[PDB]
């Protein structure tokens, strides 16, 4: 059984079948560098049945910059690295059976034992024996999935090979689409027109199935291959022999497995299938392939890596690359700069690049054992190139080893840059898995470890949960219900004691701006966000824009992700993004005419919140507004129009006093929801009622529902009644026991319950697709007098005490099982699905949709975190605009796209003057300086006359407002009335537009210093 309480988010990504196969898989890994370490980390977080790691090397002090499990003791003992860190890896997931091995690998090593595994990943390995292993892998029956990767300096390599033929079970995780059919013709080939306003959004050659189709009853259950004619029409093959078309119909996407073919590693040395990530350089990957082959040949020839700045080694590598390029099929131009940088940084190691390639490699490994997504075929190269050319031509002493754990990074980026990183002050928001990976990257990079200057700050308001343990690797089960930031910071120092870090339990918001004032932001250098919502992103963006500081953000959903980079005076803000708002389901569609199971789940969730949060709040707020029910009775007897009193009385008259009455009320609610409403809506709209044109009202998408007959023996009915009764008993504070939930006891309770007969009504139906929830229809005096009688009887029956004025309000818990919110919502949604003859849904997709759960996986977060570390290194470098690269990705395809950040625009205010979002004007003055002096100073310095002045939320001066010419004569301190806290003040000023009657054009904010 899948441990859903830990794996729900992973389930929403992968699917149960993939994990079921995953529970029967053995995966082997060779080489135990930082890359192999992170591969083990991601796989153990994903929960492989059994993982075998291998290493023939021993610990060294140099490894401390690439590993976050090693300690000085391990290096002192000269233990095998893998066997030393094996115990730490086991902490990440008890379910995973992790094993280790140290058998030497060479040309005479036998590979037959490897057949027990399904996939093998090779790191830190010599290329010819990689060739031999790959030959063994694809020769197996079935072939063993082969994956290899390498990291060298600012360069990386990734290769995949699954034999001659491999079957992808699902190309992408996108839900199959369903489209209503508006028209379809008897033709050869037949032509189908979908709903005129709903786009076809499909492609030629795809396979579709058909259901609920009227006219051609034979097309029900049939499968056809399509051919797109338009974004709203297509052809599906011959249909002339079919019967005539009537109406309706639904087309459902059909997924088909696809075979993917992989060449051998040796045969892929020439003509490699290389993924492209930068369209401006559709040749760089091949050049990098040539350079990596040249480096491998150099290591073969000289048994060593090239020395930094060694002109002899660089020239030899140039000759090797030139020779290899000549042997290539395409023979690309050898990049001298790339070869030079490879020779310069051959011996170094860059961990963020390793992080990215490890994430993508782990995702590929997951694909190899599931077939859940289309894999890489067959090569992919990642670079940190932009960093090095920004430094011009440095000296080799900048990168020579100095004895510390940071020697590996020093050989890549240089000591001065490392010192810059050590000195940085960083503010990090959000302690999600992205934040944890970023903190790990900081610790391994020596970020903020300067004993004088460097300082890290992180904050998060929430505590640790078991569900978080699936991807937030820093935490353990004995850290549950403890601060995320505190535990993360405490665990971080174990990785690196030299780090200096501070933590907070604070939610970044306008109310907490007092703690995080402008001076605090000025103290920081870089701000990074790991938020899960847009509003907080906008708030942080505005604060950082006001404080003129760089901002980094990353979004993660499923296998899709992106990186946003914002640099002062260079880029657009995050607020510059103006993506279209989500269009919600029509109100009429939600309440009355659902067609999708998502409509029913939304209806169930809204009904739940109204019943258990909103209306309880109304009841208790009513009894807080009015002291006693007798007072309300007296007031309504004098015609007082109190609000919600009618609903409160209706609730009180419906208030149960024991568990049996709670069950009775739950049964009545069931009857109301699933029998009476259908009869009412059918009374208003008969099944054969027709429109102006005579077409049936009950036509696509309008599904005519059918009333449901109750049966306690139905498991769905049993679950619905049990959950509803439990929630209602919680509502009315009625105690109960589990034995009361037993089906026989419920039957005994309902045996004496009389089911009330239906009666129709003539309530108007909001059939408008653009309608919204309006205010209530005015209440008749009949309901007034009925409620009056109700609370009069209640008072006479002593049901007017404070307890009768008390009832519980329930939060929407979504993770625990005992609260029954998920089960109640699922039961209601499935009853509504059967209600409209729509297909039901399972519990877990209900949990996903209702809880708005964003699917997550360790591979995506690691991949994005490595990139984020890369651009923050670039920001630390103070590099030009070209170096900064935003990125978007979707590992499902898989796809990675880099694109330069959006250039900051200039707002042409007037007369050729323009200003940026980063612009803030300044004015210096004195105590006798006046508003007229202010206008003159602006008109002089910036050549434009202010037309309106705003003091924050207060207005300062408007020419058309009365008597404001006098304000021109008033001094700054007199009219502002400022506090002594500042030597300045900030204002907002606009200017008259070129065309009168238009709004004044907003200028940049202006700061008036009280002094010079």
């Amino acid at each position: 059984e899948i441990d859903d309480a830990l794996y729900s988010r992973q389930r929403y990504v992968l699917g149960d079948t993939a994990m079921q196969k995953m529970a029967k898989s053995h995966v082997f890994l060779s080489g135990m560098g930082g890359l192999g370490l992170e591969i083990a980390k991601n796989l153990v977080l994903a929960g492989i049945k059994a993982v075998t790691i291998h290493d023939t090397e021993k610990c060294q002090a140099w490894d401390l910059g690439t590993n976050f499990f090693l300690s000085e003791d391990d290096v002192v003992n000269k233990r095998n690295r893998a066997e030393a860190v094996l115990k730490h890896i086991a902490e990440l997931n008890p379910y995973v059976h992790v094993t280790s091995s140290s058998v030497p690998f060479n040309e005479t090593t036998d590979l037959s034992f490897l057949d027990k595994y399904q996939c093998v990943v090779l790191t830190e390995m010599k290329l010819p024996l990689q060739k031999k292993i790959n030959d063994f892998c694809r020769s197996q029956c079935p072939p063993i999935k082969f994956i290899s990767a390498d990291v060298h300096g600012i360069w990386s390599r990734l290769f995949c090979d699954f034999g001659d033929e491999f079957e992808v079970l699902d190309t992408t995780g996108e839900e199959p689409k369903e489209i209503f059919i508006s028209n379809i013709t008897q033709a050869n080939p037949g032509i189908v027109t979908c709903l005129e306003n709903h786009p076809h959004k499909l492609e030629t050659g795809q396979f579709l199935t058909f259901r609920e189709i009227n006219g051609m009853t034979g097309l029900n259950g049939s499968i056809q291959q399509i051919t797109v004619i338009s974004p709203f029409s297509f052809s599906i093959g011959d249909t002339t022999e079919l019967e005539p078309y009537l109406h309706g119909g639904i087309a459902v996407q059909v997924k088909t497995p696809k075979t993917v073919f992989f060449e051998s590693l040796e045969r892929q040395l020439k003509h490699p299938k290389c993924l492209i990530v930068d369209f401006s350089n559709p040749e760089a990957p091949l050049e990098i392939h040539t350079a990596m082959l040249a480096l491998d040949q150099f290591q073969e020839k000289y048994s060593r890596k090239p020395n930094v700045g060694c002109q002899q080694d660089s020239e030899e590598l140039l000759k090797l690359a030139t020779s290899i390029s000549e042997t290539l099929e395409e023979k690309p131009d050898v990049n001298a700069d790339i070869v030079h940088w490879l020779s310069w940084t051959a011996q170094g190691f860059l961990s963020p690049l390793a992080a990215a390639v490890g994430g993508v490699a782990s995702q590929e490994v997951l694909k190899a054992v599931t077939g859940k997504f289309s894999p890489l075929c067959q090569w992919l190269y990642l670079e940190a190139a932009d960093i090095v050319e920004s430094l011009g031509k440095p000296e080799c002493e900048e990168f020579l080893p100095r004895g510390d754990r940071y020697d590996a990074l020093r050989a890549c980026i240089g000591d001065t840059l490392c010192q810059k990183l050590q000195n940085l002050n960083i503010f990090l928001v959000g302690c999600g898995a992205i934040g944890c990976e970023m903190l790990k990257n900081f610790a391994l990079l020596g970020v903020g470890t300067s004993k004088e200057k460097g300082m890290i700050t992180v904050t998060d308001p929430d505590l640790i949960e078991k569900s978080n343990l699936n991807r937030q690797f820093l935490f353990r089960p004995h850290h549950i219900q403890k601060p995320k930031s505190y535990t993360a910071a405490d665990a971080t120092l174990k990785i690196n004691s030299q780090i200096k870090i501070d933590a907070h339990l604070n939610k970044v918001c306008p109310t907490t701006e007092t703690i995080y004032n402008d001076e605090f932001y000025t103290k920081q250098d870089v701000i990074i966000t790991a938020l899960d919502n847009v509003e907080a992103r906008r708030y942080v963006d505005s604060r950082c824009l006001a404080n003129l500081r760089p901002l980094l953000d990353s979004g993660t959903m499923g296998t899709k992700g992106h990186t946003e980079v914002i640099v002062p005076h260079l880029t657009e803000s995050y607020n510059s993004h103006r993506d279209p708002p989500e269009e919600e389901i029509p109100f009429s569609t939600l309440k009355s005419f659902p067609a999708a199971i998502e409509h029913t789940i939304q209806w169930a969730r809204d009904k739940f919140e109204s019943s258990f949060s909103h209306k309880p709040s109304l009841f208790n707020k009513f009894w807080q507004t009015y002291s006693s029910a007798e007072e309300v009775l007296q007031k309504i007897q004098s015609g007082h129009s109190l609000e919600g009193c009618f609903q409160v009385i209706k609730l009180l008259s419906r208030r149960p006093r024991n568990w049996s009455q709670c069950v009775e009320l739950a049964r009545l609610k069931f009857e109301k929801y699933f029998n009476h409403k259908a009869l009412q809506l059918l009374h208003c709209f008969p099944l054969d009622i027709r429109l102006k044109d005579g077409s049936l009202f009950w036509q696509s998408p309008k599904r005519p529902p059918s009333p449901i007959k109750f049966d306690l023996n139905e498991p769905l009915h049993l679950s619905f009644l049990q959950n509803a009764a439990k929630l209602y008993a919680t509502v009315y504070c009625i105690p109960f026991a589990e034995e009361d939930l037993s089906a026989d006891a419920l039957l005994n309770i309902l045996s004496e319950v009389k089911i009330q007969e239906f009666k129709p009504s003539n309530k108007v139906v909001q059939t408008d697709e653009t309608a919204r929830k309006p205010d209530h229809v005015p209440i008749s005096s009949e309901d007034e007098r009925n409620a009056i009688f109700q609370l009069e009887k209640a008072i006479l029956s002593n049901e007017a005490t404070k307890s009768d004025l008390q009832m519980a309000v329930l939060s929407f818990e979504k993770d625990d099982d005992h609260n029954g919110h998920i089960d109640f919502i699922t039961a209601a949604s499935n009853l509504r699905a059967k209600m409209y003859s729509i297909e039901p849904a399972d519990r877990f997709k209900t949990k996903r949709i209702a809880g708005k759960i964003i699917p997550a996986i360790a591979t995506t977060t690691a991949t994005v975190s490595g990139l984020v570390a890369l651009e923050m290194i670039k920001v630390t470098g103070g590099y030009p605009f070209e170096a900064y690269k935003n990125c978007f990705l979707n590992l499902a395809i898989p796809i990675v796209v880099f694109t330069e950040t959006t250039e900051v625009r200039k707002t042409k205010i007037r007369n050729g003057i323009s200003f940026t979002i980063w612009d803030r004007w300044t004015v210096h003055g004195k105590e006798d300086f006046t508003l007229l002096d202010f206008i003159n100073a602006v008109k002089e310095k910036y050549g434009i006359e202010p037309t309106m002045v705003v003091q924050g939320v207060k207005m300062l001066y408007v020419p058309v407002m009365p008597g404001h010419a006098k304000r021109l004569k008033l001094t700054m301190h007199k009219l502002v009335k400022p506090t002594t806290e500042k030597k300045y003040v900030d204002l907002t000023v606009s200017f008259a537009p070129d065309i009168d009657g238009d709004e004044d054009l907003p200028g940049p904010p202006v700061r008036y210093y009280f002094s010079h």
Binding site: P510, H640, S641, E643, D768, T770, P774, D775, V777, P778, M948, V950, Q951, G952, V953, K954, M955, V958, V960, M961, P962, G963, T988, S990, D998, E999, D1000, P1002
Partner: protein
């Protein structure tokens, strides 16, 4: 019409003005000088004002200061805080030939932080201690139900529109919809009882009750308890218009006498007529007591 000429000439200068409504202490917290509704909402309003809000208000200000409807039937009077525009107060007289005629009604208006993305809050202040639901869409507590405010049902064109809707549109809609001679059938369902003898009879009942309530609060209690925001304006208006009201009260008394013989609604019209004649006598006393500012 010399009375009309002087009426237009005088209150033209008074239809718009600024007036400090919130005195301010040392620590930045607001001390409200006169009565207002959004005490806590204003005091808790975020200080991170959106610039577009202030700019839209400034652009509106020209039209709101130049194009206020001015007529003896009805006129609009506009006051806002001398240092903040989002705090708002408006006074309107009832259009002629209505049960609301010439009655003074004070409103509280606040522009939300997201304005103009959302309609401003609107509220009645002449509720007489929330005694009467004066209009079917206008609750006794003063809450306003307009589709343009999204506080009433309506089509998208009737809804609030940040790009096109204007505060002047809401002001005009007040007169055109709420301040009508025909309030009763405005209640949903009663528009179907329009024309039916029972519906018209209950309309007469409701409008007579509204008339007597207006005489009580909107005229008698308004003059006897003048509001500081328009204290001179209201007295000048009543001095100018008083000749009409001394006949309006008599015609209303004559009308309710015809109703009183009815056995269904005339029985309530008897109580409303007693109240109406009492308040009419008191109102005539106050008119004789009314000076010219």
């Amino acid at each position: 019409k010399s009375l009309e000429e002087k009426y237009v000439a005088v209150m033209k200068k008074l239809q718009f003005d600024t007036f400090e409504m919130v005195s301010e202490d040392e620590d930045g917290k607001l001390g409200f000088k006169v009565n207002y509704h959004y005490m806590s909402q204003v005091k808790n309003a975020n200080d991170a004002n959106s610039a577009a809000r202030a700019r839209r208000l400034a652009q509106e200000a020209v039209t709101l200061s130049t194009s206020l409807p001015l007529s003896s039937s009805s006129s609009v009077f506009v006051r806002c805080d001398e240092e903040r525009l989002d705090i708002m107060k408006v006074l309107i007289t009832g259009p002629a030939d209505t049960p609301y005629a010439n009655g003074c009604f004070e409103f509280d208006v606040y522009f939300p932080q997201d304005y103009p993305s959302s309609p401003p809050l609107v509220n009645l202040e002449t509720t007489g201690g929330h005694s009467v639901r004066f209009n079917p869409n206008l609750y006794n507590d003063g809450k306003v139900c307009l589709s343009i405010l999204n506080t009433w049902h309506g089509r998208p064109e009737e809804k609030w529109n940040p790009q096109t809707s204007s505060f002047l549109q809401v002001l005009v809609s007040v007169q055109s919809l709420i301040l009508v001679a025909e309030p009763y059938f405005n209640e949903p369902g009663y528009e179907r009882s329009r024309g039916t003898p029972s519906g018209t009879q209950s309309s007469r009942e409701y409008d007579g009750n509204i008339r007597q309530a207006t005489v009580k609060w909107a005229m008698l209690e308004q003059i006897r308890n003048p509001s500081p925001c328009f204290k001179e304006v209201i007295h000048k208006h009543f001095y100018l218009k008083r000749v009409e009201i001394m006949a309006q009260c008599e015609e209303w008394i004559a009308d309710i006498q015809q109703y009183s013989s009815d056995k269904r609604v005339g029985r309530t019209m008897s109580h409303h007529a007693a109240a109406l004649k009492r308040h009419t006598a008191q109102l005539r006393e106050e008119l004789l007591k009314l000076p010219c500012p």
